[PDB]
Design a protein around this nucleic acid. Structure first.
Length: 108
DNA sequence: GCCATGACTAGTA
DNA sequence: CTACTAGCCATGG
């Protein structure tokens, strides 16, 4: 499986995530038939162009929190987007954006 | 080949 | 709950 195919399938899957719901890097990786490619799913989101209509903001980590980038802008950009879709985000003693996974998890 | 990087994760302490 | 691990694997130099 070429990587250009992987990116396309990941993007396909992410576009399926319904407005107001979220999924997981690991889930999308399993959904497209590549259980060990959680990190690569992360790459796929990163490599996206900013003007994309792919809802990358709907893909969080298995712990139900927003992953931290090298910078801090992307993280913040995801929270704002999610809140704009009605997702209730709450912060942490450690300053981690977190949500109720079972409540917002997209279950195919 | 090497190695460092990095939007990950199930497991363990 | 947090923190740190091994396993993980494409990417770029």
């Amino acid at each position: 499986m070429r990587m250009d195919e992987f990116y396309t399938k990941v993007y396909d899957a992410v576009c399926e995530i319904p407005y107001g719901k979220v999924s997981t890097y690991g889930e999308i990786a399993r959904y497209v038939g590549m259980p060990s490619y959680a990190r690569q799913v992360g790459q796929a989101m990163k490599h996206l162009h900013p003007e994309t209509h792919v809802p990358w903001h709907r893909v969080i980590n298995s712990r139900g929190t927003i992953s931290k980038r090298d910078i801090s802008a992307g993280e913040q950009r995801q929270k704002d987007r999610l809140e704009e879709e009605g997702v209730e985000i709450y912060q942490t003693s450690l300053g981690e954006y977190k949500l109720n996974l079972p409540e917002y998890m997209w279950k195919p």
